[PDB]
Amino acid sequence: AQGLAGLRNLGNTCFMNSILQCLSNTRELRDYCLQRLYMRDLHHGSNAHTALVEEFAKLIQTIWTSSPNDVVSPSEFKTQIQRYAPRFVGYNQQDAQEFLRFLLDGLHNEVNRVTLRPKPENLDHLPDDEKGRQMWRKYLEREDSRIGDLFVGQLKSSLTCTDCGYCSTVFDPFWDLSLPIAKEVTLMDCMRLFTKEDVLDGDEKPTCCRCRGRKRCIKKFSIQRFPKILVLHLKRFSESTSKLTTFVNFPLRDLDLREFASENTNHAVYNLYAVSNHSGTTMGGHYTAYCRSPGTGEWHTFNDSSVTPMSSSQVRTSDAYLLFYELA
């Protein structure tokens, strides 16, 4: 059985181990490391302070050449991430999604195909979809890597003035989506709440450029481009600060997001392959991961040193915090 290596907790590093295992079981990312394809994308060598990709890839390699029950130490990798992002220095518990964003940012920057990022425009003459495509091309002139190939999508935000009827549109790239907890509550309810028409009034009235006054506007998201790997981050934060422990019912296969698409499409169906779990209180809690092996299709719990089998029926729990979906 391949890739079933545990990771040693170095002191409150279960957040790190959870995310590493989610990435380890991200098929195309894993292969990028195993086939050493990053070597062609790095433009120069590293030193002791800049070997993030190198140490990440070696860790993935070690996990996927281990025997089952092997425990691997990610100390050298941790040294590299904390040098890139000093917030990870030391041994406090950290948020898994914060770690995810910093790690992928560093991996991406190091293998960016753009080596000299170039230094906007009025696109109102264009139809929505053509403008979207122009904005996407502009983004790729600055950010273009094999890591981006996997995780990057494009949100369309539509802002309609209820007075003059002008709908203003912007296209924001995204590497993940942080979804509100809606309303048992389903993952589809959360995505519906994310994308719902939001009435902006009172202290939230935007200024409409046409009316040149504060106006009640309606803002609505749709997805202009769907990423190969969809990372969904559940906003488990309640107002009255403390953790929202609501059971969110997410599907293991056939997450169909065609309804949230900007245009009619067919390539918006996802299968789950990993989950980052947080159990316990807002402070002093603990991270594990459930991951589907890309080779066998079987699920395992990865809890630091301990890797154990589980049924797919045990994957869905109220501790699910990050969901890793792949295009079907």
Partner: protein
């Protein structure tokens, strides 16, 4: 009269998924932005994280640094630790 509103508006997707509208300048810092969110949401700046185009926005940078333009959405999240 009143102090001027910011030259540019951006949105924040808050914890419940409702959006708020912020009055800003390209030269406003992420700290400035977090203070504005504190004003609207009651969340201390040191608990806030803001994501835009996959980047967590960092104190010491400005909105212009991240090419954040008018009507962009910043995504507000906190922490589980």
């Amino acid at each position: 009269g009143l102090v001027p509103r910011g030259s540019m508006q951006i949105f924040v997707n808050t914890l419940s998924g409702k959006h708020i509208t912020l009055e800003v300048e390209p030269s406003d810092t992420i700290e400035n932005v977090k203070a504005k969110i504190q004003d609207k949401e009651g969340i201390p700046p040191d608990q806030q994280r803001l994501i835009f185009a996959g980047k967590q926005l960092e104190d010491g940078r400005t909105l212009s640094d991240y090419n954040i333009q008018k009507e962009s959405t910043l995504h507000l999240v906190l922490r589980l630790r």
